[PDB]
Amino acid sequence: GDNTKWNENQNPRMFLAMITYITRNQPEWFRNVLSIAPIMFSNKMARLGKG
Amino acid sequence: KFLPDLYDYKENRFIEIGVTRREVHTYYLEKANKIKSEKTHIHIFSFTGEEMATKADYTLDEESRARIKTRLFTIRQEMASRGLWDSFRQSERGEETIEERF
To answer: Which among A3, A45, B70, B80 could disulfide-bond with B85, CB atoms 3.0 to 4.6 Å apart, if both were Cys?
Structure first.
């Protein structure tokens, strides 16, 4: 196999779906601190390089 | 193994300071565990005016023992004359641990 367009067809919104689930019944601070990174990838804003 | 508070050069015994608003025979055996087989001097100060040392031998002299326990009483009275004196103080001295409100 190989996966075509592997990076565009992800979504960090289902990364947040995973790390909300693989931190089941974990403490509140710990489930929170892993959760910021799929949040601020799901609002990320790429620059457009030089020009 | 656990950190003392000060150190005297003459006696070469480490210094652990216990300040209480609770009765002193709480802290004489609360602070004594996990310390022993060592030469660490235990010496409890208090808001009230009482005091307890190791083997009832006071290293600190009379004028400075009477000065600190008065100032702790001045800490006790100004805490009492403020309007917020002892009840909320009782909770945190046993509850010091990892909280991490994130």
So the answer is: B80
